[PDB]
């Protein structure tokens, strides 16, 4: 079903010119997606425990993986060109009384490693996105009509809101422990893949107005009449965002309750966990450092432009940030498998920018790359987009990657568009 | 158990591997722990395992070292696909265990039946694996067919058939042909089966004068070895009868011959209904059957064993016997918790100096997180010995990890006897390089409060007449007002740094101008007292 | 004359006591040896329990007394001043527990008139004290927190926030937490008699089954345990059944051996063997 997509991938390259080289980078993955829909149609009308299946679910993987390769390229490639044309043109003079909102804006137009950084949590944003695909409606709760409806039907709890447990006594009903867990866990995962108006209207229609008022209270102050750049309607924020970091910081420390509660809680606000990152993925763990370090770099810029008052530090923050290399150790410790995996080998390095010397190393051990029959196709893809885009690709390099690419359409009896 | 010699042994047969700052045993080709394989055996003498107590264990060791015990052949053979002489070598090692564990009971019964018949000294004796000593004892005593007939127990057919024809023929024909009892046992034991092919002359009743071990080495001895493996014939002597509930000798031949296949399903249902193994023994065989190839283990069963091993070494006192067991865990989030809480509980006995005597750093050669050995021996320095000594072993160990105030509030108790200052000299000294690893740049105002107060007390100890403020001396001041605003109103009741921050400030009050040098004012001390009144005693007239 | 709870320090340090004669003795223990080092006095009613709190956070010792009042003393320089004092409750306080090592500096207090209290540290020393009313139908007499239970980027680690408390009518079982302002319990269990006397959580060693034993008045053991993580499920086992009542039941950390401390004035040791039922071990004293 994939023999294809190597002819599909060449008319591609063919129809478009050096000037439309991100619209042939979002033909690949179109190519790569409609090729992973026949492929997910075909695994799972197979009956589980069918060995014959294993290549085909491998085969999947491999697509998947590269399909979501050919979106990061596209978004930080955009990013990186569109910035080295715009370097000639900006002085911006700050405003004395610029709101968190405007100051962001400026940081996000001015520095392109917290632009390039939210890149990578957008696009990992994107992948855990597709993976939930249309399956948030059918969500079974025992619960049909109010929170709790277990523990109320069973009276205990003299408080209605959320503060019995400091105050006193610690009983009410299990079902309702359950549906606040679940919903909890729900929240999460929806914070994870990047639906959070999505996650508020949940929360909304379940009844958990104060969490969704705290869930929504993560965008800083942004006043429309102050700030004059990013005018809108009316003010929008809060004034009480290291209050309000400082108690989420204070939550995920306490322990013994609701896990689910407090992973929720320290992702929203900009935390890492512990028992919820065994089961996570690499590309979920990057995005959730990737964040982290934004976070950081934001609260460092926020202290040194005397942005927030003295009272407001209530609690100690951790003031260092990670970088690149940091990151990339973090990964590694975190999933070696992942790390040596070609396809998020790749993906890094295209994250990270030393995507030429990458594609010199793949070139030099190629005379256990062979084994690998679509990484030496997705590396000269990848040459050939960076030598239509620019000129930074080594020609000995190049030469050798047109050599391996006639070689193997010589091999599979398929040279008539070489 | 005590030793560290077997520790020390028993970590470098292993190959540990640091994953995700946990260690885990991958591949290990043997323990040096209680009751383990080939190596346990030389840890049992009169002077380890006491003397009372020691044949017991040995003998279990020395079972299932030669049962559960992988065999290997010296000289390699041309067909490697099979497994001929390791069965037989291992069969041989198995018949001269049983025979050496029932000559003890079998010496005292042939001396009872030397006096009363002599046709059954050489059944007796045949049971101890000794052919020649009864041919010869046959020969010697009028017999002649029964000398030439028991020359041929091999255990191969031909005479298989005929010993059971020559019972059918004796059975019947000629009247019932009363032959002698101790013959009987002798002709049917060479037909492959004593206790299954003989209708007749079945060999059932004689477990009343003899044990279990007997009839199962009659049978693994002397029947048909060459048509089924060990681990068959064992089985199959031991569904025949039922041997004791409540002994390690009786489930160590039970649980190795038919729990080939479901050895997961055999040792859950023993010790469910009896205690015979112990909590380390039961440990050790599912690790030695696992790294070997041996049998089917289950992974939650090797988790409660190596948890179980490592709470009973670690409520005695051994701490690295415990980490050594915690570390051979499956779930890396229970292992690092284990071993967190196994640093935090002893630590300072677990290394190279400082009242310890370990095996070069065992905290650190198996593969083991370091840091985290040192923050757990500094917390407990913390709350078990001064505050003064504690935080010298914390920023030193190279393991703080912005841990700088909890630093800098440990070393300010020893702020007295101001003749003593080289302490406080080093402790400000040291403190920048902790610092400057753990990257911090931002908060560094106690630490320069406290080595600038020793450099100021020093100038004017040495220099009485120079009272001018050089720069750093605002600084000194701000960092000294900073630190008493925390006492002075931020709601912290915290005595200690309060005094230490006074002393602090105090310390160059008799220098330059100090315009403030004050105690508790009257908000606060009119309405308590005791604590926080003095640095305003010199007012005795009007200016 | 009579203590009432001694509870040892960290790592096997200090063994701070109490008795009904007002006085919260910290004694030293040093290779055996027992040594007082320094009397804290300052409470109109008897001690009831005691517990020291972490070492990350210095060296603080709470101790509940009769005089509806905490205090909170702190050990450094060999000053053992008296830091906090929250006195929220309106009768005497009954037991009086900490939380984990990484929440922290948090405190839970319960009363005997219906209440309880919450102190959390702030940044300097603050302790938000938010408490209310309407608890049990008589008071509060058990309070103990469950084990770390923890929740991928590069800062503070999650857990699972706080929340637990503990009555003496016959319930005693955990809590649930949210996402809002404090936390929102959800955990009913009642399987007891008379009044519950000392209810104290089992330490979780890595795996998800996390138990909690209680004891009322009636002289029953139960041992609460879970089926799974975040499952509907609080069957209660019970362990023994004597003929006069329990005072406190303590839990081990490596095989969690059950100390049930009552009865005839003799403490007892149980432990769960491999077929599911609780045995004593042996006999103290």
């Given at each position: 079903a994939s023999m294809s997509m190597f002819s599909d991938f060449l008319q591609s390259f063919l129809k478009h010119s050096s000037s439309t080289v991100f619209d042939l980078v979002e033909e690949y993955e179109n190519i790569c997606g409609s090729q992973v829909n026949i492929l997910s149609k075909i695994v799972s009308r197979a009956t589980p425990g069918l060995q014959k299946f294993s290549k085909t679910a491998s085969m999947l993987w491999l697509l998947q993986q590269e399909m979501v390769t050919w979106r990061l390229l596209a978004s930080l490639y955009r990013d990186r060109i569109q910035s080295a044309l715009e370097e000639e043109s900006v002085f911006a003079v700050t405003a004395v009384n610029a709101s968190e909102k405007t100051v962001v804006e400026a940081l996000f137009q001015r520095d392109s490693l917290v632009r390039q950084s939210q890149l990578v949590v957008d696009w990992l944003e994107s992948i855990a996105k597709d993976e939930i695909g249309e399956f948030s409606d059918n969500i079974e709760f025992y619960a049909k009509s109010v929170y709790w409806e277990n523990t109320l039907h069973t009276p205990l709890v003299t408080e209605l809101d959320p503060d019995a447990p400091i105050r006193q006594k610690m009983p009410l009903d299990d079902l309702d422990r359950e549906d606040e867990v679940r919903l909890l866990k729900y929240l999460f995962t929806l914070i994870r893949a990047g639906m959070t108006e999505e996650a508020q209207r949940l929360c909304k229609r379940c009844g958990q107005a104060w969490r969704a008022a705290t869930l929504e209270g993560w965008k800083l102050y942004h006043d429309p009449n102050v700030n004059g750049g990013t005018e809108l309607e009316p003010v929008e924020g809060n004034p009480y965002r290291r209050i309000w970091k400082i108690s989420c910081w204070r939550m995920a420390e306490d322990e013994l309750f609701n896990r689910y509660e407090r992973a929720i809680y320290a992702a929203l606000s900009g935390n890492l966990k512990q028992l919820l990152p065994v089961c996570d993925t690499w590309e979920d763990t990057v995005w959730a450092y990737f964040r982290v370090m934004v976070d950081s770099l934001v609260e460092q810029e926020i202290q040194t432009s005397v942005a927030t008052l003295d009272e407001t530090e209530e609690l100690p923050r951790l003031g260092a940030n990670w970088t690149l290399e940091k990151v990339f150790e973090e990964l590694q410790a975190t999933d070696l498998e992942e790390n040596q995996e070609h396809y998020h080998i790749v993906q890094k390095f295209l994250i990270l920018g030393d995507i030429d010397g990458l594609m010199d190393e793949f070139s030099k051990w190629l005379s256990r790359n062979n084994l690998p029959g679509h990484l030496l196709r997705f590396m000269t893809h990848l040459i050939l987009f960076f030598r239509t885009l620019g000129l930074q690709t080594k020609e000995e390099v190049s030469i050798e990657v047109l050599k391996t690419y006639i070689q193997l359409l010589i091999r599979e009896k398929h040279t008539n568009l070489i | 158990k005590l030793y560290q010699t077997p520790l020390e042994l028993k970590l470098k047969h292993s190959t540990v591997h640091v994953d995700e700052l946990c260690p885990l045993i991958v591949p290990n080709l043997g323990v040096a722990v209680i009751h383990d394989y080939a190596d346990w055996v030389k840890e049992a003498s009169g002077d380890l395992?006491?003397?009372?107590?020691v044949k017991h264990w040995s003998l279990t060791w020395t079972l299932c070292e030669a049962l559960w015990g992988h065999l290997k052949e010296l000289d390699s053979q041309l067909?490697?696909?099979?497994?001929?002489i390791q069965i037989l070598e291992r069969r041989r090692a198995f018949s001269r265990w049983l025979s050496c564990t029932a000559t003890p009971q079998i010496e005292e019964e042939v001396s009872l039946t030397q006096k009363n018949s002599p046709v059954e000294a050489v059944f007796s004796y045949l049971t101890g694996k000794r052919i020649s000593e009864a041919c010869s004892l046959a020969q010697q005593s009028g017999d002649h067919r029964l000398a030439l007939l028991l020359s041929q127990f091999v255990g191969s057919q031909s005479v298989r058939e005929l010993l059971t024809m020559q019972l059918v023929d004796w059975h019947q024909l000629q009247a019932d042909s009363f032959i002698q009892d101790e013959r009987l046992r002798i002709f049917a034991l060479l037909a492959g089966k004593p206790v299954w092919q003989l209708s007749e002359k079945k060999q059932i009743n004689v477990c009343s004068q003899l044990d279990w071990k007997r009839s199962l080495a009659i049978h693994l001895w002397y029947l048909l070895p060459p048509t089924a493996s060990i681990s068959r014939a064992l089985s199959m002597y031991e569904e025949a009868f039922q041997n004791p509930l409540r002994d390690v000798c009786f489930h160590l031949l039970k649980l190795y011959s038919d729990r080939h296949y479901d050895l997961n399903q055999l040792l859950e249902p023993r010790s469910i209904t009896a205690d015979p193994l112990d909590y380390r023994l039961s440990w050790h065989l599912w690790e030695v059957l696992r790294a070997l190839n041996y049998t089917h283990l289950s992974a939650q069963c090797e988790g409660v064993l190596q948890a179980s091993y490592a709470g009973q070494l670690e409520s005695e006192g051994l701490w690295e016997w415990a980490i050594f067991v915690l570390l051979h865990i499956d779930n890396s989030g229970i292992r690092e918790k284990a071993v967190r809480e196994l640093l935090t509980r002893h630590c300072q006995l677990l290394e190279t100096p400082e009242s310890w005597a370990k095996e070069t750093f065992l905290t650190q050669k198996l593969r083991v997180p370091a840091k985290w050995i040192h923050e757990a021996k500094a917390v407990r320095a913390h709350m078990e010995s001064d505050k003064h000594l504690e935080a010298l072993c914390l920023f030193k160990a190279e393991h703080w990890n912005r841990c700088h105030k909890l630093i800098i509030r440990h070393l300010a108790s020893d702020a007295i006897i101001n003749e003593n200052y080289d302490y406080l000299k080093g402790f400000l000294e040291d403190l920048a390089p902790p610092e400057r690893s753990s990257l911090i740049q931002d908060w560094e105002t106690s630490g320069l409060v406290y080595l600038d107060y020793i450099r100021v007390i020093e100038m004017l100890r040495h220099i009485q007449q120079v009272d001018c403020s050089g720069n750093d001396l605002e600084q000194l001041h701000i960092k000294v007002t900073s630190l008493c605003s925390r006492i002075e109103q931020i709601q912290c009741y915290s005595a200690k740094d309060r005094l230490a921050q006074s002393d602090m400030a105090k310390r160059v009050a008799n220098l330059s101008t100090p315009d403030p040098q004050r105690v508790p004012l009257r908000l606060l001390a009119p309405h308590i007292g005791r604590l926080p009144m003095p640095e305003d005693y010199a007012m005795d007239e009007l200016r | 004359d009579m203590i009432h709870d001694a509870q040892m320090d960290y790592y096997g340090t200090r063994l701070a006591t109490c008795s009904s004669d007002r006085s919260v003795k910290i004694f030293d223990v040093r290779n055996g040896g027992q040594i007082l080092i320094a009397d804290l006095r300052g409470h109109e009613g008897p001690v009831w329990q005691v517990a020291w709190a972490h070492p990350m956070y210095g060296n603080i010792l709470a101790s509940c007394s009769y005089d509806r009042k905490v205090i909170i003393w702190r050990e450094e320089n060999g000053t053992w001043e008296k830091s906090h004092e929250h006195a929220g409750h309106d009768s005497s306080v009954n037991s009086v527990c900490w939380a984990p090592h990484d929440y922290g500096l948090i405190l839970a207090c319960g009363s005997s008139d219906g209440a309880i209290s919450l102190l959390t540290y702030t940044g300097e020393g603050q302790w938000e004290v938010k408490k209310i009313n309407n608890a049990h139908t008589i008071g509060c007499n058990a309070v103990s927190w469950a084990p770390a239970v923890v929740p991928p980027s590069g800062q503070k680690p999650n857990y699972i926030k706080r929340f637990a408390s503990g009555g003496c009518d016959n319930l005693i079982k955990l809590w649930k937490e949210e996402e809002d302002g404090q936390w929102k319990e959800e955990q009913k269990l009642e399987a007891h008699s008379d009044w519950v006397r000392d209810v104290a959580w089992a330490p979780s060693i890595g795996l998800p089954t996390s138990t909690i034993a209680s004891c009322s008045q009636d002289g029953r053991v139960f041992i609460w345990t879970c089926d799974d993580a975040s499952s509907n499920t609080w069957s209660p086992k019970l362990l023994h059944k004597f003929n006069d009542v329990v005072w406190h039941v303590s839990w081990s950390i490596t095989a969690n051996i059950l100390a049930v401390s009552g009865g005839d004035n003799k403490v007892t040791l149980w432990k769960e063997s491999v077929d599911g039922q609780w045995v004593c071990i042996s006999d103290v004293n």
């Open positions: - | 395992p006491e003397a009372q107590i067909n490697e696909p099979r497994e001929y | -």
